[model samples]
Target chain A: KFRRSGRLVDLTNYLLTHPHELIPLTFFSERYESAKSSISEDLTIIKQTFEQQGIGTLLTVPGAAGGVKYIPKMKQAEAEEFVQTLGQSLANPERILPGGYVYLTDILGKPSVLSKVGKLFASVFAEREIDVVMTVATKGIPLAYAAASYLNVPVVIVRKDEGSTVSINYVSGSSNRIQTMSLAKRSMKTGSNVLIIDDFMKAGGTINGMINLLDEFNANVAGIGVLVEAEGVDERLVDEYMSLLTLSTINMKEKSIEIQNGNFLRFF
Target chain B: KFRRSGRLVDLTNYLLTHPHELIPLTFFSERYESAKSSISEDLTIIKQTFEQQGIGTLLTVPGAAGGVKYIPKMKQAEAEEFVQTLGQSLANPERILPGGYVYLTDILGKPSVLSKVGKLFASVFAEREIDVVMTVATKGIPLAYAAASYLNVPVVIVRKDSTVSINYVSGSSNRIQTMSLAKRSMKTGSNVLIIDDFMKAGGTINGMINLLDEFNANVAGIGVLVEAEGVDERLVDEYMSLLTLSTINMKEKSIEIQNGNFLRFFKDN
Candidate 1:
């Protein structure tokens, strides 16, 4: 009951749930009674870390009339369009032809590309209400970084194994692989809505396992955010899922990629 | 020549001075005789890693008229504002109460606050113009991170001591005192520029000394990118200085910081 973590969750939840009203440092300091200076420092850390990690922002409203506010910035149409475009590009035949392996890690690298895609993801949860940003490590860091950049939330990178406690995950735990798939735990407050983000989703097994992990904790999937989702399998899951690009096939042998029409061209 | 140490720098220099234009994946594939897909992957890594590391950026123009634009992303206005505002903020008497240390690490940790500051400092240099981003590790990471974010350049942190191999200083080694202050060796072929987010005279000296140890090769000191100036010692050093703020009295003793109100503010002077 003493873990500041719980109260912080409530504080963040309140901020996310209520944006029009600004939550000032004074209120937080008085509520927590940690020193005002420390609180200010904490708020600054929260604000910076959240922004740097691409998590939602700790909105600071400057001046006398200007108190602090944590305004979660996510616009739905913009995000959906980006997701659709990404999905389209992923599905293109040029992207296919060989055996099967899509390349998108490149798109994830470009800041100019990621920023646009990031803002779009940020917009998706505009009003959906999310608490934390989560992703697995390494390859997912870029996408997670980009998504977290726009939202201003602390990115929680769920460790695949218990030993990988270095960075962060939506929740801190270990991940194991089953037969031909990967599995692990998703940590968040019960009922906490998490936006799942990843590079590609083919079998959707990984995402499925992640979803199961979230279910294990009774957490709700705010939504799944993917850079490219191979149509046939991914589109069938969850009515609310959004993907920036679609990859129907990948010719590992031929070295050709096809770009399908994703959210970008569709919405706009 | 082919190493991971300064991959982005090598790539940036290859792209820079060649033409400030974008190079498509297919073009690089044909030149290197590698698969277009492989070339595309390389470009993506170069772009994102560059931005993530705070060195500079990868710009994709999009469409036939677009391929990829490499820009350093830093300009004069940014340099002036950063140095100016920092000088202004340091004017507060509370900052220099006692101790030689200035309370900047706190500011560094604040992402939102530093984001703007970092962006401005980053804007001082154009993306393609700079090959690698250089800074002494630890505190510099944040500024380096921020500047790298905007410029999309990969930052190579040089430790004052030879922790490993990659470390270099900002000046002819002794001129800046950076050699004594920082703790490592820098990577080679780095068309480097230094970023010391905030500084004190002595500490500034340490930064310059670190540069001397570099044998005057890769690390290039463009000018001063700082919050405030301490005192004289460094003023006579001839290192092309730029001061955003000048803080003194290191202990409970705060000195007034003055901003050059001349056209220098707007003129890059």
Candidate 2:
């Protein structure tokens, strides 16, 4: 027979690791060798603390086969603070590249930063029914996984090579040339509500390519998220998407960069 | 003045998220508006529960700047069970591709599975002081980030093109290629741990090692999630793997996989 403190600790860890999973109360009761009422009381404590801390909420389903689900979310204040800090880091002059590009690999490479970014994205899309998180190869992979971890969904990588079963050709938004992207046919299920994620968006050509590939699989674009979106593009191919930071100006000659908070908070 | 239950819940969440970080007791006491003695009592509860559940241990430092640190670890029995289940998943024949390559993108694409893989790798390399986690581009990026999360380290990506780099030979294909990493990606004399999704002849891993030399970084450790067998001339050694793909019989459409040296760590414990 486990004590209340032990049960709380173990249950909290289990819920943290298994987000979006519906865990039966019986399982917890059985594991703790306690009564269902005791388990319920423990859950109340956790749920209250989770809400007070802005961790997220635990949804309770009252019926047979119903239990609890932890939906991770970031508070509006926390999200804004995080994005402001992220924006400042991105505005560093040293992040400027030779061709007006901002070097964001370092920021994206940090797991701590990615965790917050994932939580923010998950918070924004918490109410939506997303089945999967999708992103292109290389840079977007980490961001995709980070978001997917919070969303409790699988990630599908769209690649530039022919290793995938289905391929699509789309015009590059930055460069006018046509580029190809591919995805495995079996990677995603039909009718999945996918949230597209990318590290940076120049003109949304790559994101558009992913949308076309999703068409092949009959998948729906639940939402789109980018870590950084560049400004000054003549035209934007994607109209609806969320970004953490917007690279508004990159004065290469002066070695200066300017970034702003994105439309992430506008939705809230 | 938070209640004991509320304090316990919040503290556990904080420790779980901030692994390897030292939190001063004063900070906690102030946050909860409780005394240091009360905070310590709550920590004791969490610490005892963590160990009993095989989650990890809370290392309490005693001194002026003393506090608690959560060292994430996996129990021996739990780690072995996870690896076995992963091995069985890999043995499925449908994973075989045309050129003897197993299709693992789906498995690697799973965040849940990657979380476990990350935890396991972190547990295995927990003792080492790793400043950064390094990996090549594309496939290994997710795995690298996964492990880095648990290690609380930044990941540096080695790409096929860009700057500050070296040219090395691919042991598997014998093709001379150039790999580049931004100069600002890593600092000099820092300890870097290498992580990858898979290793065939260990050419890529070897290349990463050579690349590390350019940055003057020390190889803290090397961990691979899956390594293929039957390579007579292994380019790089002195690494650990979670699973070994011993055989991939294309003719019979079967794959034979077994647990790797990771389990050896748990032998005595």
The whole-model lDDT of each prediction reads 0.50, 0.85
What DockQ class does candidate 2 belong to?
medium
Q: Mark the 10 consecutive residues where model 2 chain A has the least summed lDDT.
A: A231-240
* Model 1 per-residue lDDT tens digits across residues B1-269: 22221222234434532333567755655555666555455567666544543334667766643467665443455556665776666666555433343444334433444455555555444433665455554444445545555666555554443333333234312442222222223444456656665454435434443453453534444334453444456533333334445436646467666653322422443
TM-score of A-chain in each prediction? 0.57, 0.94
Looking only at chain B, model 1 earns a TM-score of 0.53
Residue-level lDDT tens digits of model 1 in A164-265: 113212321122334222222322457877788877666566666567666766778887777766667643444356666666545666565665644433
Model 1 misplacement above 4 A: A1-99, A162-191, A216-218, A234-239, A253-256, A263-268, B1-147, B152-269
Compared with the true structure, the alpha-carbon lDDT of candidate 1 equals 0.50
- Best candidate, TM-score-wise? 2
